[PDB]
């Protein structure tokens with residue numbers, strides 16, 4: 276939906292994306308209370324393919340409604356700069372939010388975050404939407420610590436296209452890297468890496484290993500070890516997500532069910548390696 280630019284006030288530049296700035300501001304439309312929004316801008320000097328690539332993210336988001344998927348408020352297209360407005364997530368990207376708060380949230384809180392991400396993914400899979408870039412950097416966190424999935428776009432990765440973005444190797448399931456077969460099952464592998472990011476308070480998956488070191492290690496049966504203090508039951512769910520055979524990995528409803536069980540039985544989280 277097209278938003279009248281008079282309805283929008285931009286307050287502060289809070290980040291950068293691929294095509295421009297990310298800002299915090301305020302949306303106020305006739306008949307509605309004023310709300311806080313995030314605003315992605317696309318200023319002059321862009322091509323129309325890029326304009327449509329930019330705006331595709333809004334088209335896709337506008338197809339979804341779920342409490343763990345970032346909500347679109349609208350777009351500004353008949354004015355400059357071109358804008359996408361979403362709900363504002365006050366704590367920003369999860370990886371950096373966790374590094375900032377290293378060791379400061381309880382296991383139960385971290386499992387609740389992971390449950391939120393899994394529910395988002397459960398919804399997307401149900402919608403037959405394959406995310407392809409599921410990583411803690413793409414999870415946004417509000418002031419109540421509710422985690423929501425973000426980063427929507429359907430553009431092939433560069434390796435999928437003419438001979439003459441790149442695949443996020445560290446998050447990507449082996450068959451997806453080898454064959455570019457991206458499915459909800461390859462998203463479940465990425466979710467496993469996200470679990471590890473969360474329980475490690477935002478450490479980089481595979482530390483300093485090169486992308487090709489990662490590819491080889493995984494092919495040769497290596498899997499990330501439990502982060503420090505990580506409950507064994509969470510690490511095992513990670514290992515389930517990391518099965519080489521994609522059909523053996525848990526589907527997202529099963530992932531959510533497993534996390535809900537943990538939350539109902541928090542004593543089980545006390546078993547650590």
Ligand SMILES: Clc1ccc2c(c1Nc1ccnc(Nc3cccc(N4CCOCC4)c3)n1)OCO2
Pocket residue numbers: 289290297313314315332345359360361362363364365366367368415425426
């Ligand atoms: Cl990821 C994304 C996708 C599409 C879109 C966006 C985003 N970014 C986004 C959406 C909602 N909330 C945020 N929150 C945020 C971004 C950058 C920095 C921060 N800070 C929070 C406070 O600590 C400093 C970082 C929050 N971003 O904004 C408008 O359209």
Ligand SMILES: [Mg+2]
Pocket residue numbers: 406407408426427428
């Ligand atoms: Mg993506």
Ligand SMILES: [Mg+2]
Pocket residue numbers: 408426440
């Ligand atoms: Mg991406």
Ligand SMILES: [Mg+2]
Pocket residue numbers: 475503
């Ligand atoms: Mg540490």
